[PDB]
Symmetry: C3
Subunit: 314 residues, 3 copies
């Protein structure tokens, strides 16, 4: 698979700052080398230079709106560039607010994309339903066409144009959804598989339904926004908003192995890895290592094994 790597060292979508170190620790773990170790054509576009916006007072309750808005506007441009280069954009991120730019830029080149959002959260709060004011919990609200008219004019997001319909996204792993968020899910008829559904059906059926749901009518590019807190904190502890009872390491790899097999992966986000939040050096490496494994699975690494098209017995 051909990849376009984009480091997005950004954290202003939430309170803890160590998330901007995500691109660095993932590269350090040898993500490029390992990807290349597979039949992968890897091109690193480097880390986007997110300049500081010193003047960025809250918009009502919403924090760092201009900084978050600018980072996504800049990222949207980069992602559209890599997509125009015929490569799968791989955004090594900071916080999940960056999904606004990643999906936006991706949709500019492939308006028919479908989204799979692996997360413990729906991140669909609007600037008016949010209680935390953290934009990493509102990315989906800015992207949904059905919600346009419910999103106030927030400084820094005038460039945004809702690019996805409520029917073009599936959530997997939900276990901490706010009331307003749940109201939005039920009201717009958004397809989701919370941890309850995963327990009920098993990850196998969950994925069968997810892909059938998004690819049934017709094949379309797939955007996978993977928030590492979607997995249980026993696997990815170094993250800002962890929630117990998450998806297992195995389910995480299953999700990605299945998405890979579709041959339709078009965009990928590996978000919320925050080394600074690891209670120990080992929790940090455990989080980074799991984040790498998930990424590799998205690009072909299978647990049953892989082999080149040659005669190994000769």
């Amino acid at each position: 698979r051909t990849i376009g790597i984009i480091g997005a060292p950004f954290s202003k979508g939430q309170p803890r700052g160590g998330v901007e170190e995500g691109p660095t620790v993932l590269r350090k773990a040898g993500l490029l080398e390992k990807l290349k170790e597979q039949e992968c054509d890897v091109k690193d576009y480097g880390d986007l230079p997110f300049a500081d916006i010193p003047n960025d007072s809250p918009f009502q309750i919403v924090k760092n709106p201009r900084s978050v808005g600018k980072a996504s506007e800049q990222l949207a441009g980069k992602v559209a560039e890599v997509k125009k280069n015929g490569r799968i954009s791989l955004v090594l991120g900071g916080d999940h607010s960056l999904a606004i730019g990643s999906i936006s830029g991706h949709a500019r080149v492939h308006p028919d994309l479908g989204v799979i959002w692996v997360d413990a959260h729906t991140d669909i709060n609007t600037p008016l339903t949010t209680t935390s004011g953290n934009l990493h919990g509102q990315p989906v609200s800015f992207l949904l066409k059905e919600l346009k008219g419910k999103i106030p004019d927030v400084p820094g997001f005038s460039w945004v144009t809702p690019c996805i319909s409520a029917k073009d996204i599936v959530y997997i792993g939900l276990r901490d959804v706010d009331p307003g968020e749940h109201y939005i899910l039920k009201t717009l008829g958004i397809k989701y598989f919370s941890m309850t559904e995963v327990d009920r059906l098993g990850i196998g059926k969950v994925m069968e339904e997810t892909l059938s749901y998004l690819l049934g009518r017709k094949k379309r590019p797939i955007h996978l926004s993977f928030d590492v807190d979607g997995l249980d904190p026993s696997f990815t502890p170094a993250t800002g908003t962890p929630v117990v009872g998450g998806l297992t390491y195995r389910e995480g790899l299953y999700i990605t192995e299945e998405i890979y097999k579709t041959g339709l992966l078009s965009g990928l986000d590996i978000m919320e890895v925050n080394p600074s939040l690891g209670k120990t050096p080992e929790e940090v490496t455990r989080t980074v290592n799991t984040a790498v494994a998930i990424t590799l699975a998205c690009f072909g690494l299978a647990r049953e094994g892989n082999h080149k098209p040659i005669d190994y017995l000769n």
Copy 2:
């Protein structure tokens, strides 16, 4: 849902004493506040005052029979009171021997109840098949009509009257059943899903079958006796008789979320939480926190989220 909370600080059904602190640590974790935080009508009936019975020599091998018998007789009265008040009895317990009084009192108001027993143990030893002499491993034998005639006249239990038939109970999570207990299961035809069945069918099918088994003929009140050792000790370590390979945090919440959805939960027991047995301050909080989560799920807290009947988008 409307709840009637009853603290049962009792431990004489087994050897370790810290179990009588269960009501205290659960209240401390803010169980009342959290329940009220939901659309819950909560009334605390307080902690029952289990007076000491200084003279209580063993009945053969059975220990503290008068103390255990009295605690259940007193609890049976309280539970019947809260049930008569039109509320779901929530017994914050000490050891599982208290199930004798909780189910007995519940059955006085609702004789048609069905029981779901989540536990690593069947707790169905009779005073004659028990080898430990601990009454927390014999509660079910005193309640089963089919076993009346096999239970000797034990001091303190003359007030008991078997109130449930072998067909009105389902076990979930079994993994440490004594030989005599297993003989009773097979002989009376008791429905159970040991860890083997959960592994085979998945918790989803297990619950489908459980509810169909108990509610098929007709809807009836449900009594859920949840022993925290039913869950794996990785989740609830501070308990007296832990057994590895237990139900997961997720399966525990799935069990309860499904029971809640029936709208038939009538009685609930959260038992065997023993803070004094936590190897660390964290194992204690981990056990208490999991015990609280399970309780909240029984009363409506769903992992996919919850929302009031208002227009959140306005």
Copy 3:
């Protein structure tokens, strides 16, 4: 069930030496006593005396070929002896290279046997596809009839005769398969259930398919080669080649409980337990205890309980 215990304190199939202590720590944990505690007829044949072969230079890249070859030749003889005694051979092993002798000796008495290989690895590298040179990752290549002609004349294995066809073996738990190994799987059409298949179908369906696959045409003796690294290192950490995302404790017991129920278990290998690799005294006991539990399940210990054919209520 009637058992013939054979200790195989061998480690030259891989680099770390503590694996030869496997028989000792398993016996110490009281494996004999516990087996006898069940309706088991247990006969200990003791630990085979694997004499040192001082002169054993590598064969190309392959290490300790004469030592490994001799240990398996000696073990093959013992296993055939216990099988001739009408007992299920239970090989308490060192490294997995010993599977060559165990399956070879077993097949001498029961040529129609079927093999279930529980492992994170396929251990099917040939002396020419191996990159590590460790023979514990090549046992299956020496046993497969279809691969005879692809295995060079390695010092110490002239006694070997491929005894199993590619169709008589099923793998369960795979998650670290080398490229050449994967090529062999696909080329010979070997049946396997990697962790991906377990996630997809659930261990219940995996076992249904496994047994149907091997016993469909006709009932035949079953050889279970259980590598403890097949289970997740959270359960069996003290092992030489651990791989995350393994089978759970529950799945491990499910696998074995199901095999037991067939009444066809004929040979068993409990391999790769290396006490010397436990980061703590507790990781060692955790590994040994899990290894014992798996063994007991193979011989009748069920999680739902067991009872003798008597009237426990009397």
